[PDB]
PDB file of C-alpha atoms in Angstrom:
ATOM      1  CA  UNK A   1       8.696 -78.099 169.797  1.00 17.51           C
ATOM      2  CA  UNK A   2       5.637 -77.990 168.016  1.00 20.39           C
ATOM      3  CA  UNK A   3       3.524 -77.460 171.131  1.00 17.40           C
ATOM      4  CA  UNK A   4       1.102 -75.179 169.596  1.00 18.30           C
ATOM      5  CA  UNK A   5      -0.132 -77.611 167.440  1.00 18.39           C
ATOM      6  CA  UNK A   6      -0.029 -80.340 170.124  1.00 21.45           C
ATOM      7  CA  UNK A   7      -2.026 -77.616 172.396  1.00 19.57           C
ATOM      8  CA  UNK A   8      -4.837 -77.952 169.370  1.00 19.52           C
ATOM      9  CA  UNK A   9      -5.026 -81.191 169.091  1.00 20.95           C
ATOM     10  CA  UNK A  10      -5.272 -81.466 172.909  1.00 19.63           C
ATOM     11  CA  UNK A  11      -8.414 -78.909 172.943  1.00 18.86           C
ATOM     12  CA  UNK A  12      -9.835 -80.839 169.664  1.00 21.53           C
ATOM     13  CA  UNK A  13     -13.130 -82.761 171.349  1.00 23.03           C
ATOM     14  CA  UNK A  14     -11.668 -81.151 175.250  1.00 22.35           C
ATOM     15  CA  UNK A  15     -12.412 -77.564 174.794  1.00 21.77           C
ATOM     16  CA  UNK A  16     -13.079 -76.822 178.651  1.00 21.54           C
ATOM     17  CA  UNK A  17      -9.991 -78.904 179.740  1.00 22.57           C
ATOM     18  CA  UNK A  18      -8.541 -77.163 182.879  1.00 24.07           C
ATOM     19  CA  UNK A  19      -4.514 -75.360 182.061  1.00 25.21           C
ATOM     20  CA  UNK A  20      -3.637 -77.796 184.752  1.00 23.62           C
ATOM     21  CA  UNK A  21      -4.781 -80.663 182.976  1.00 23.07           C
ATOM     22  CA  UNK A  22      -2.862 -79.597 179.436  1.00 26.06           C
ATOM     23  CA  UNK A  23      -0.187 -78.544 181.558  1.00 27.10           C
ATOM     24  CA  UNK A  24       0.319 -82.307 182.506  1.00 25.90           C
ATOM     25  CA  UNK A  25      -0.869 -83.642 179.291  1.00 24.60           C
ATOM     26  CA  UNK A  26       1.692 -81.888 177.243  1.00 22.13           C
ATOM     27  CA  UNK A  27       4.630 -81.887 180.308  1.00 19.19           C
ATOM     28  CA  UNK A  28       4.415 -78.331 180.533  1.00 17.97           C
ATOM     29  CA  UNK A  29       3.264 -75.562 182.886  1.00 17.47           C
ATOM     30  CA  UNK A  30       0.315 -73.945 183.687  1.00 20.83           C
ATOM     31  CA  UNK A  31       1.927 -70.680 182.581  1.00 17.34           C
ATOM     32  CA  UNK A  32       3.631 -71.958 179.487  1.00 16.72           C
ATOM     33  CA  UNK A  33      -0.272 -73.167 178.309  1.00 16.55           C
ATOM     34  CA  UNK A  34      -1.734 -70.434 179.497  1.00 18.43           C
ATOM     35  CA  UNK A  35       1.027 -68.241 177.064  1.00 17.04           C
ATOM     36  CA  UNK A  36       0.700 -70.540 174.281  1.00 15.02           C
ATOM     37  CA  UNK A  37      -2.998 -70.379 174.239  1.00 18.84           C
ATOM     38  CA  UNK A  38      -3.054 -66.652 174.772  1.00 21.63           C
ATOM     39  CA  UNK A  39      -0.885 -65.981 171.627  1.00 19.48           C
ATOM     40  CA  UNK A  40      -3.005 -68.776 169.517  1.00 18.09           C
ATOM     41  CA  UNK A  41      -5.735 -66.677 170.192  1.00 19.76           C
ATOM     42  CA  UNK A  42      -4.090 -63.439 169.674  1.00 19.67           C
ATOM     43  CA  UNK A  43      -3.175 -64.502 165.997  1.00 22.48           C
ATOM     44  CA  UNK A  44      -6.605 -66.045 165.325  1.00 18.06           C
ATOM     45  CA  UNK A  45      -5.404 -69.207 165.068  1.00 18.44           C
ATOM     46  CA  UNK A  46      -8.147 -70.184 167.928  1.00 21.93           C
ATOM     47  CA  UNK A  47     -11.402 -67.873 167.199  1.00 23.13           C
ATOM     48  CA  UNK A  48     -13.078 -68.973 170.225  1.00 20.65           C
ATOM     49  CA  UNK A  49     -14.282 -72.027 172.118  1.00 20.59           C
ATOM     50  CA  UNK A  50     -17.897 -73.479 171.614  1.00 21.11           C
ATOM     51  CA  UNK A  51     -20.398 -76.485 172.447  1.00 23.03           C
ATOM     52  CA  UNK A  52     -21.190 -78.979 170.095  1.00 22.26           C
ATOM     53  CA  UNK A  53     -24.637 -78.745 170.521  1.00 20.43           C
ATOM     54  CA  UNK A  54     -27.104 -81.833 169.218  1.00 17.95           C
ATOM     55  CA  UNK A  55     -29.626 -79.940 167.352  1.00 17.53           C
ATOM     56  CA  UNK A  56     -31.669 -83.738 166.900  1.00 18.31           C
ATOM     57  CA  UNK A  57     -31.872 -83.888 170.492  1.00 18.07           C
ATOM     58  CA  UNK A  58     -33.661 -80.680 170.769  1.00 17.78           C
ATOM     59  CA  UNK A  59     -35.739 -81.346 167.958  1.00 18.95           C
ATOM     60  CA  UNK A  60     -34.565 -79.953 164.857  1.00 22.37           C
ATOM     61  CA  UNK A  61     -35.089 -83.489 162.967  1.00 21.46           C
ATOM     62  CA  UNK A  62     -34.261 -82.274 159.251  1.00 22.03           C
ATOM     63  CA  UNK A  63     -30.864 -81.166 158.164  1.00 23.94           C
ATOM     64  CA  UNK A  64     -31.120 -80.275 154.355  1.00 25.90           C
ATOM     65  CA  UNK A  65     -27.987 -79.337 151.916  1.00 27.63           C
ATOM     66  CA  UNK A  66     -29.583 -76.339 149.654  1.00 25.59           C
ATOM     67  CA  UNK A  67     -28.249 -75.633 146.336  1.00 24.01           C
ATOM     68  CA  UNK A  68     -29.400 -72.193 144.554  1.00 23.15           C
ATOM     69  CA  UNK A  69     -28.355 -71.007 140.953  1.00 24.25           C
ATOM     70  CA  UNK A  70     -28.182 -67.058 141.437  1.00 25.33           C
ATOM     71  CA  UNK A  71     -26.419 -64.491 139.134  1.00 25.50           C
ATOM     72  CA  UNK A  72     -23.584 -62.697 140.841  1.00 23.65           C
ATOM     73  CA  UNK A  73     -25.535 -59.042 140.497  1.00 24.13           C
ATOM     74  CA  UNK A  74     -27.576 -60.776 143.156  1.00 24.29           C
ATOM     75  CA  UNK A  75     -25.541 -62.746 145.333  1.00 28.83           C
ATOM     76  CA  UNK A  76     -25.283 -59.773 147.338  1.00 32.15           C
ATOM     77  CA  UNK A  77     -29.248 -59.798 147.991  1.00 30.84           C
ATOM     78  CA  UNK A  78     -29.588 -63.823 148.477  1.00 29.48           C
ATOM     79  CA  UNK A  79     -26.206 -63.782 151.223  1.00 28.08           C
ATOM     80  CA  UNK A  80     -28.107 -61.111 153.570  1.00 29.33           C
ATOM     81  CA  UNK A  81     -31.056 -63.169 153.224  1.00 29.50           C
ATOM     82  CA  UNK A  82     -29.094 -66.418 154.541  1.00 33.00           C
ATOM     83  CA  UNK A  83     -27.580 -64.694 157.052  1.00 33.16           C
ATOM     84  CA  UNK A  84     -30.720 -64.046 158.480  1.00 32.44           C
ATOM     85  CA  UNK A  85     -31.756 -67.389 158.509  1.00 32.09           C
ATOM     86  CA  UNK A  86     -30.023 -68.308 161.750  1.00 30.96           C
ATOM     87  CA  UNK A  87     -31.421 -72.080 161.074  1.00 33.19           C
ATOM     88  CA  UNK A  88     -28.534 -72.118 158.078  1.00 29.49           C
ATOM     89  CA  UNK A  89     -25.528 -72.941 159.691  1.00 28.59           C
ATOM     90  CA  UNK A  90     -23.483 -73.047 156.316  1.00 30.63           C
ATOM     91  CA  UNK A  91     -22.927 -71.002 153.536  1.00 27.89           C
ATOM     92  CA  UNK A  92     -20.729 -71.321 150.488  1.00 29.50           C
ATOM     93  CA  UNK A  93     -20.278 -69.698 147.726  1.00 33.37           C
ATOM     94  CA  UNK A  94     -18.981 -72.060 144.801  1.00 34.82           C
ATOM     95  CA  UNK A  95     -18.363 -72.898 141.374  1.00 34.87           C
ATOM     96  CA  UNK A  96     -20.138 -74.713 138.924  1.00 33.36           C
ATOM     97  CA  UNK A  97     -24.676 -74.467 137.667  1.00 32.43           C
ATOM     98  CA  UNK A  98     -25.220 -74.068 141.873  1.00 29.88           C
ATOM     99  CA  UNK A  99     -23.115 -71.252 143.045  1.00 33.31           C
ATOM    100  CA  UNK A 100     -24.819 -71.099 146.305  1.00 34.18           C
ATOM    101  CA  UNK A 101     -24.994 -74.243 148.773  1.00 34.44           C
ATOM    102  CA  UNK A 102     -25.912 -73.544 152.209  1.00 35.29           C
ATOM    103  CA  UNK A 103     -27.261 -76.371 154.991  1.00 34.22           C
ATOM    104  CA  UNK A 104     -29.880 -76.061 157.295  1.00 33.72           C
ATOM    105  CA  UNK A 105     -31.125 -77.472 160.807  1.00 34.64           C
ATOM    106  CA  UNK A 106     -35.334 -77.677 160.273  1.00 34.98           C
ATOM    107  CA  UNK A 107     -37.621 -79.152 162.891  1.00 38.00           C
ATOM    108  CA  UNK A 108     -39.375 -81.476 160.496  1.00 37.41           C
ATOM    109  CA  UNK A 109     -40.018 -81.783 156.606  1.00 36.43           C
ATOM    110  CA  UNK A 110     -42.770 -78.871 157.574  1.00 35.44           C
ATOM    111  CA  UNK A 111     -40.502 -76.403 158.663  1.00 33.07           C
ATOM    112  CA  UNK A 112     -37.615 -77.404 155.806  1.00 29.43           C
ATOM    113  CA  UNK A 113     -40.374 -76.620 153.098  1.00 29.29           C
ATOM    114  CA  UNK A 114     -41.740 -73.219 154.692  1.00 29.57           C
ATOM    115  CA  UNK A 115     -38.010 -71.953 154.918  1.00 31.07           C
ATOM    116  CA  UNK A 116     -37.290 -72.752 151.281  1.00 32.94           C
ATOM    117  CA  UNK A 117     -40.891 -71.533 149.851  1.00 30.15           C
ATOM    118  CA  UNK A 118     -39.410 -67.699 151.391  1.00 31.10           C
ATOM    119  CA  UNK A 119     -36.267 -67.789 150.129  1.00 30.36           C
ATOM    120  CA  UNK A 120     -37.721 -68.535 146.692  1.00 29.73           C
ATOM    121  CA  UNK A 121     -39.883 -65.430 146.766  1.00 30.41           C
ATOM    122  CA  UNK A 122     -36.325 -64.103 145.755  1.00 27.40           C
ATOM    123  CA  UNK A 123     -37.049 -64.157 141.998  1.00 27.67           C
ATOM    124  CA  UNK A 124     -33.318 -64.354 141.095  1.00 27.29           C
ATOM    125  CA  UNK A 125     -32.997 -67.698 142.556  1.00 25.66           C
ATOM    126  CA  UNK A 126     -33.458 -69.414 139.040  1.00 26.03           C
ATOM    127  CA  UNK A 127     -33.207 -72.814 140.193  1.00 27.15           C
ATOM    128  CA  UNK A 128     -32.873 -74.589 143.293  1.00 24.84           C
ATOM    129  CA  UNK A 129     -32.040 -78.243 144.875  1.00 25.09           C
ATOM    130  CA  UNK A 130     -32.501 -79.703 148.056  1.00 23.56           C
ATOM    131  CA  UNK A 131     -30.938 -82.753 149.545  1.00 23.79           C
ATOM    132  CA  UNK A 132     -32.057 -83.952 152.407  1.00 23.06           C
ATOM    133  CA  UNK A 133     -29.690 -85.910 154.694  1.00 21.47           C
ATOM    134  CA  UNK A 134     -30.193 -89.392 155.315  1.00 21.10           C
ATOM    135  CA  UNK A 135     -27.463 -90.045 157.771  1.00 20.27           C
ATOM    136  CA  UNK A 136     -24.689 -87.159 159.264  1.00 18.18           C
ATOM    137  CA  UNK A 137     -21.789 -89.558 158.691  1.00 19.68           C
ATOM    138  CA  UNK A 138     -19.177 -86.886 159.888  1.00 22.82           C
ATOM    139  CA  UNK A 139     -20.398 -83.619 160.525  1.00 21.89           C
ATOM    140  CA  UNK A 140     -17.935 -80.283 161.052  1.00 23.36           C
ATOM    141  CA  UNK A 141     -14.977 -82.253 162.644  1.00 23.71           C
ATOM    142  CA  UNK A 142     -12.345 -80.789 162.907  1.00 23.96           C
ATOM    143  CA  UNK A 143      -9.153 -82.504 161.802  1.00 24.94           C
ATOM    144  CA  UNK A 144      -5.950 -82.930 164.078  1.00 25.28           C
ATOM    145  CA  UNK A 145      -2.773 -80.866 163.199  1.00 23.66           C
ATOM    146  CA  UNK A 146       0.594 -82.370 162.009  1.00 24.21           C
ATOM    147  CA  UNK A 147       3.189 -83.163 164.855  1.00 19.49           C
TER     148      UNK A 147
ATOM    149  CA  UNK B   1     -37.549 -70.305 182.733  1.00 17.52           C
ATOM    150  CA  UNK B   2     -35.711 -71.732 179.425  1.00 15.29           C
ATOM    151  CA  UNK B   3     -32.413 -72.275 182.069  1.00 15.86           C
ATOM    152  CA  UNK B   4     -30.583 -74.797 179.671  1.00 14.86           C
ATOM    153  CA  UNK B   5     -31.508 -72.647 176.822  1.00 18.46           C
ATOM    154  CA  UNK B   6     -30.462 -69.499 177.857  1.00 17.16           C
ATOM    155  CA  UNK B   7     -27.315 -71.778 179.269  1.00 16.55           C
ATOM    156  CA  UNK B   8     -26.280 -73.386 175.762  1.00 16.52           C
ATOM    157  CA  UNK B   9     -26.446 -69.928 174.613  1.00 16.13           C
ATOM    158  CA  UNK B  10     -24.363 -68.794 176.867  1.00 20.75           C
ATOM    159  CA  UNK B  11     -21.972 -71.424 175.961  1.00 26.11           C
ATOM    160  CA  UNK B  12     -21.758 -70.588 172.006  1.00 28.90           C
ATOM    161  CA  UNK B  13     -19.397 -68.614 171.391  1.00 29.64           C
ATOM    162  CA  UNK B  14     -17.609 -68.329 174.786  1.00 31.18           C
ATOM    163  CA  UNK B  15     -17.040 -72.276 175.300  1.00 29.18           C
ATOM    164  CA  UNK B  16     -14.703 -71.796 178.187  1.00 29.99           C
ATOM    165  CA  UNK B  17     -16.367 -69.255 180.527  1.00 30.73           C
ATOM    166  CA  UNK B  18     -15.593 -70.059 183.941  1.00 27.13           C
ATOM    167  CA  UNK B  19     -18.668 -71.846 185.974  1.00 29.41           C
ATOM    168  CA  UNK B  20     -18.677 -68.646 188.013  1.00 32.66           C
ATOM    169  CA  UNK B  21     -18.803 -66.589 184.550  1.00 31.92           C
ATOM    170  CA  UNK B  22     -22.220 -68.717 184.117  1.00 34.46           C
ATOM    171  CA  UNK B  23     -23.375 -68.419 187.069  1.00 34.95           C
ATOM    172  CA  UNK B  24     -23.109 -64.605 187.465  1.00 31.76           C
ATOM    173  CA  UNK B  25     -24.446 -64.014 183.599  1.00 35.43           C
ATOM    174  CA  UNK B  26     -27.146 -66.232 184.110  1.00 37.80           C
ATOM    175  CA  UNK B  27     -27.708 -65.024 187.912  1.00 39.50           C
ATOM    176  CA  UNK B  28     -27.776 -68.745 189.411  1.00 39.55           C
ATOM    177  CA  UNK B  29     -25.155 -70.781 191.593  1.00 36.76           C
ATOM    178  CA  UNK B  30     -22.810 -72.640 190.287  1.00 38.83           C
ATOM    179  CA  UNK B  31     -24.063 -75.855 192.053  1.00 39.34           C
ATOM    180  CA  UNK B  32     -27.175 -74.840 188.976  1.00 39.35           C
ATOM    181  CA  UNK B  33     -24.720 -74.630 186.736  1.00 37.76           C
ATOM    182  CA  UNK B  34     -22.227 -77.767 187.067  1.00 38.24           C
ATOM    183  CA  UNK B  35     -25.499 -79.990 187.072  1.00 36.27           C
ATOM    184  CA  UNK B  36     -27.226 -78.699 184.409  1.00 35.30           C
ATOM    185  CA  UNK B  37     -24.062 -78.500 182.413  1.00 32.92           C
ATOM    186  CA  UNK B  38     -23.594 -82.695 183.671  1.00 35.06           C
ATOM    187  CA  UNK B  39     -26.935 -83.794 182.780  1.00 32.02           C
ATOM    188  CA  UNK B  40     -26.964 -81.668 179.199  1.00 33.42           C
ATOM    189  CA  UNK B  41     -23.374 -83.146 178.509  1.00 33.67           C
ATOM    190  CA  UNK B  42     -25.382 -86.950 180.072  1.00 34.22           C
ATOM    191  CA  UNK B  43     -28.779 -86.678 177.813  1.00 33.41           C
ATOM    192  CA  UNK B  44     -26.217 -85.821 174.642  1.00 29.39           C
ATOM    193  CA  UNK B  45     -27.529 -82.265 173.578  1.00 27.97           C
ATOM    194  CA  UNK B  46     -23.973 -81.163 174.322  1.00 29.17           C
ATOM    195  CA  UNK B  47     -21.633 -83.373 172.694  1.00 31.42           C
ATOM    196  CA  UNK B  48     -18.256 -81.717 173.644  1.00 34.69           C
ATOM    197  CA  UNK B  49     -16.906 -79.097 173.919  1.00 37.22           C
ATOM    198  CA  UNK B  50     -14.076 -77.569 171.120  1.00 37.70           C
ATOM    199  CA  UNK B  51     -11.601 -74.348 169.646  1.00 36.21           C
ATOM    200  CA  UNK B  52     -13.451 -73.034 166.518  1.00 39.42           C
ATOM    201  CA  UNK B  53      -9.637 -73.190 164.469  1.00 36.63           C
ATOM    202  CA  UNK B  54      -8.980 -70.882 161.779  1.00 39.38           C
ATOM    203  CA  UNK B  55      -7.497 -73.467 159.109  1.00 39.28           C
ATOM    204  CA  UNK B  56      -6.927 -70.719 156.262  1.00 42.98           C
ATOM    205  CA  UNK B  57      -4.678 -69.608 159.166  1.00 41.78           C
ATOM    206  CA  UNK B  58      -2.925 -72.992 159.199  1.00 42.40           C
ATOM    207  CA  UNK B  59      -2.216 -72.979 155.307  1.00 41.43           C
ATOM    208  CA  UNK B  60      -5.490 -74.811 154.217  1.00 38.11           C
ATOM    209  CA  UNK B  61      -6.555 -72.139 152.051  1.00 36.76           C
ATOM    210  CA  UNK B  62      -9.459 -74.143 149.862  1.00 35.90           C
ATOM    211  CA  UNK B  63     -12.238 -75.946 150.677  1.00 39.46           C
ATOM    212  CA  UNK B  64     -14.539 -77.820 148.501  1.00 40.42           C
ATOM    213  CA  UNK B  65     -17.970 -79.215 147.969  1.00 40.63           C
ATOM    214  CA  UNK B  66     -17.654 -82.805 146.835  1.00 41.40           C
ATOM    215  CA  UNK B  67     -21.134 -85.049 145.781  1.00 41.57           C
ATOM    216  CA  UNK B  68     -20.804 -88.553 144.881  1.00 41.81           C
ATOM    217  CA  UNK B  69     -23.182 -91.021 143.316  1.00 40.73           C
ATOM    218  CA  UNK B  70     -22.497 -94.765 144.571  1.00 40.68           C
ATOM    219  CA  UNK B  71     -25.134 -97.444 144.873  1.00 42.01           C
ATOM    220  CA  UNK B  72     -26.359 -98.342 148.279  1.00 41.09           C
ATOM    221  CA  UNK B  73     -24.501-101.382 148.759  1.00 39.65           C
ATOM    222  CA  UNK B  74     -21.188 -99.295 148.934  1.00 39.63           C
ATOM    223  CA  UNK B  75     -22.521 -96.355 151.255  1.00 40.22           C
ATOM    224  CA  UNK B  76     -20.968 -98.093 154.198  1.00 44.06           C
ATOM    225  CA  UNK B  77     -17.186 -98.322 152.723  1.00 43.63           C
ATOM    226  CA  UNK B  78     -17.253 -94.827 150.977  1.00 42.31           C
ATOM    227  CA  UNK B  79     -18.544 -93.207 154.015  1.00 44.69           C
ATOM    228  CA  UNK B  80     -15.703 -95.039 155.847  1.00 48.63           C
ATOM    229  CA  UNK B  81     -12.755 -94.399 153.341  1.00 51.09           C
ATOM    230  CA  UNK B  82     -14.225 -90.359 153.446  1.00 49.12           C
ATOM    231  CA  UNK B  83     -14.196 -90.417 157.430  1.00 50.16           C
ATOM    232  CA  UNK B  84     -10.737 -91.844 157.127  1.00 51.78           C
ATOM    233  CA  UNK B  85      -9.307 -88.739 155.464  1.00 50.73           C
ATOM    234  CA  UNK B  86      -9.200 -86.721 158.441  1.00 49.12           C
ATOM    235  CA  UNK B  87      -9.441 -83.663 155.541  1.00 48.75           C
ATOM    236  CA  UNK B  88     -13.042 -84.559 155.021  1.00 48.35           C
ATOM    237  CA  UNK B  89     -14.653 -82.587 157.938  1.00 50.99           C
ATOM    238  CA  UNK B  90     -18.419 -83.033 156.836  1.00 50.76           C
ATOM    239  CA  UNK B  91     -19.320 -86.386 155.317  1.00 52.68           C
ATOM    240  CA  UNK B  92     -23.493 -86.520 154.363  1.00 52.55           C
ATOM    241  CA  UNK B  93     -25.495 -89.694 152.925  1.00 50.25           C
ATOM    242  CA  UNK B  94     -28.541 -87.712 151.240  1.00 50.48           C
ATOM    243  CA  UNK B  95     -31.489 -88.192 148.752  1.00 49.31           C
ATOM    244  CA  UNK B  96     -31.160 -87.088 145.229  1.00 50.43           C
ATOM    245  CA  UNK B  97     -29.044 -88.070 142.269  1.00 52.30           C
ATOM    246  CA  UNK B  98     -26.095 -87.475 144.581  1.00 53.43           C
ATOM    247  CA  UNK B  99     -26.098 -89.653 147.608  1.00 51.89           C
ATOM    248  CA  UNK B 100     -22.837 -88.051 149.313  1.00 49.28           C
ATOM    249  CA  UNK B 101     -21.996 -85.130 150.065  1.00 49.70           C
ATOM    250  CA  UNK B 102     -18.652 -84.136 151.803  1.00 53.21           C
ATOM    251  CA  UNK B 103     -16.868 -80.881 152.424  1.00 52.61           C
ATOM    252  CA  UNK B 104     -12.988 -80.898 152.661  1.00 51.85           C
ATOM    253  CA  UNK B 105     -10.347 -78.451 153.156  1.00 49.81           C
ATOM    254  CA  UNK B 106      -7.197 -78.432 151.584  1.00 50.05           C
ATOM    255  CA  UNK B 107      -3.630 -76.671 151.463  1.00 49.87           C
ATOM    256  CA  UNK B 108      -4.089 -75.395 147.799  1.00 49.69           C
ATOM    257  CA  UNK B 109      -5.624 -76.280 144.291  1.00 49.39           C
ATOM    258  CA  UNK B 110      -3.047 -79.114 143.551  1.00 51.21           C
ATOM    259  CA  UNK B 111      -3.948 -80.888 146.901  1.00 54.36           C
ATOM    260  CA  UNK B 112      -7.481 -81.175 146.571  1.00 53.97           C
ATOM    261  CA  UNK B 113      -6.780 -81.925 142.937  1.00 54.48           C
ATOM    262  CA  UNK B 114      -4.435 -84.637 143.518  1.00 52.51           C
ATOM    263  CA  UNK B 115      -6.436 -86.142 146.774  1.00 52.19           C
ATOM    264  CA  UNK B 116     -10.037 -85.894 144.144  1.00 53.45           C
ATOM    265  CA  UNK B 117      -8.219 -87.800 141.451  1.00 55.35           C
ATOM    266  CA  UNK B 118      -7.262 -90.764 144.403  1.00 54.04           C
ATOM    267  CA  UNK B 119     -10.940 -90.522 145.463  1.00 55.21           C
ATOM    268  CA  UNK B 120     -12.232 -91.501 141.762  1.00 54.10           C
ATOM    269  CA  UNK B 121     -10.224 -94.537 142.018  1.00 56.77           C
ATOM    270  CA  UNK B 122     -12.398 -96.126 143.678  1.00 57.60           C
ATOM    271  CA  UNK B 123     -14.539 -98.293 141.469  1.00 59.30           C
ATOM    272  CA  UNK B 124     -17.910 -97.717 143.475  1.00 59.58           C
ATOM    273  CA  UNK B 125     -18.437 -93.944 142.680  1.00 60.26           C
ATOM    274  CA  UNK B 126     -20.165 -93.971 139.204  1.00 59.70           C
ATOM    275  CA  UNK B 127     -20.699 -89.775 139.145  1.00 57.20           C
ATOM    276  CA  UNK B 128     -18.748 -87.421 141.152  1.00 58.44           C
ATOM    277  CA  UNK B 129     -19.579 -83.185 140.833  1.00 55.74           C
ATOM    278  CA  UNK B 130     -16.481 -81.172 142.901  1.00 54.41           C
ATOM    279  CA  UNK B 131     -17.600 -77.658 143.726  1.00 52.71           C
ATOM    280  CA  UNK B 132     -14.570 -75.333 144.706  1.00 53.50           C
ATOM    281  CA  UNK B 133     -15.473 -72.851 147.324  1.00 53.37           C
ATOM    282  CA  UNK B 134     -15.210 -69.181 146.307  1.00 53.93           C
ATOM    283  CA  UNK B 135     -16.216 -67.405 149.703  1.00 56.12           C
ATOM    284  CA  UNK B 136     -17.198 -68.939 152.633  1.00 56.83           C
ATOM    285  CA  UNK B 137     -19.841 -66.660 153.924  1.00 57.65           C
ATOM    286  CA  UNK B 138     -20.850 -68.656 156.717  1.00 57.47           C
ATOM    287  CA  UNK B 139     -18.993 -72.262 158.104  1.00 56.60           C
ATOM    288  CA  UNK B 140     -20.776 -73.933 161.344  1.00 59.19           C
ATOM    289  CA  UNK B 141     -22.053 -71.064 163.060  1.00 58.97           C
ATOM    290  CA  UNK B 142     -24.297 -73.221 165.371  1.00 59.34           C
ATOM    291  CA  UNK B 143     -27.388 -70.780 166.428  1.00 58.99           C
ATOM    292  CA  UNK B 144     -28.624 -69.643 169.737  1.00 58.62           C
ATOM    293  CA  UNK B 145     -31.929 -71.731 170.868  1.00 60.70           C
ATOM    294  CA  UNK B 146     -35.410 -70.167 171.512  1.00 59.96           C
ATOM    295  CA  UNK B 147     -35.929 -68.454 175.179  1.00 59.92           C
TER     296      UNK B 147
END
């Protein structure tokens, strides 16, 4: 009865929790978990398990929200570049004047400006915007399923 | 040499590898391991440890962009109403025009219109900007540290 969802939620901030310990937090056993998760995974409901690694501890100070205007011909060109830009750990492609907005991790203001300066050496990037972030209220969490 | 570097990265992208896994990839005991892992988890540079969950999976098949302007004074309570909807998984105070920035996900175009239209309610946000997202090339794909 909705145990797959309570299963999630149980994971949600306890990724490395032991089947022994969900088994007793959700009154179930080991190999009912160890099913349940299986088949989650199977049907990519769960893509994997990660850290949530503090990039300000190990000194990438800056996170920046980047906003590009580029015409669709060359979305293709300004996506590969992103993607190889490891230090961009989002990227959307959206309506509206800015149809690109990724967000990066920089070590300082320094290293925010150099990364920007190449990707503007793309000459179809007709205008650009960067926000700099003052305070990570909430950042990528994860919300807890319906029971 | 770069141990809790080449451990994190270890860690992304296989978040529940067994201590012996670790040990064995990174050719160390798991006594190195466990107290590494401790004291990384201790100085904060891991955080926790969570399932990367498909939502679009889940029915939550749009996500959106949303920048606010509100004046400084009212930071505090917008960030805090925001963080509230569990639906807002990225929350940013930044510099510019916009000082917000949030991304939410939602289960189709009438939810994050009707849940938008709430938002705007509230007296303090004077501008407001909602980008819908047309492809999300990349979301959160924390990179692997220098080693």
């Amino acid at each position: 009865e909705n145990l797959d969802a309570k299963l999630i939620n149980a994971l949600l901030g306890d990724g490395r929790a032991s089947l022994r310990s969900l088994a007793e937090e959700l009154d179930v056993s080991v190999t009912t978990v160890s099913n349940h998760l299986r088949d989650l995974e199977d049907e990519g409901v769960i893509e994997g398990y990660t850290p949530r690694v503090n990039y300000d501890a190990l000194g990438y100070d800056v996170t920046a929200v980047i906003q590009l205007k580029v015409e669709g011909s060359a979305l293709p060109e300004i996506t590969e570049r992103l993607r190889a830009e490891k230090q961009m750990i989002s990227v959307y492609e959206v309506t509206g004047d800015y149809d690109i907005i990724a967000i990066g991790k920089f070590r300082d203001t320094d290293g925010m400006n150099t990364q920007i300066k190449k990707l503007l050496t793309d000459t179809d990037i007709r205008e650009s915007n960067t926000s700099v972030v003052l305070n990570a209220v909430t950042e990528n969490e994860q919300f807890a399923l319906d029971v």
